[PDB]
């Protein structure tokens, strides 16, 4: 959960130089990002997720 005593920090990305293309190539482009855990990663204390919910039993 969100908590200031255990704040994690910041991730940012900056142009180091430019994007340079020849004529007849698109000057706009896209990057994609992926996340995963390292081999030192772990979790504790099982709980219920806030993402699933229900008002009546389904049918």
């Amino acid at each position: 959960a969100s908590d200031e005593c255990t704040a994690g920090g910041f991730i940012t990305c900056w142009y180091q130089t430019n994007i340079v293309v020849p004529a007849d190539a698109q000057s706009s482009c896209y990057i994609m990002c992926f996340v995963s855990a390292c081999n030192d990663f772990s979790v504790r204390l099982l709980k219920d997720t806030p993402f699933i919910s229900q008002e009546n039993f389904f049918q």
């Binding site: 959960a1 991730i11 990305c13 142009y15 482009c29 896209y30 994609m32 996340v35 855990a37 709980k47």
Partner: protein
């Protein structure tokens, strides 16, 4: 953009300068809306505590 494929795309382009910002977000792997619905995030939301290192791959 959360109702399309554009949510996964990071725009970059040829600029008329350098050093401007591309993105930024906080390291809150379970609570940030950037991270909360990834595989890592969806598992985290069943737990109270997390520890360890994380990898971000860009393509």
């Amino acid at each position: 953009k959360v109702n399309s494929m554009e949510a996964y795309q990071i725009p970059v382009r040829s600029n008329e300068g350098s050093g401007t910002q591309v993105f930024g977000f906080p390291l809150q792997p379970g609570y940030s809306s950037v991270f909360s619905r990834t595989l890592l995030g969806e598992i985290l939301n069943y737990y109270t505590h997390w520890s360890g290192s994380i990898k971000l791959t860009f393509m």
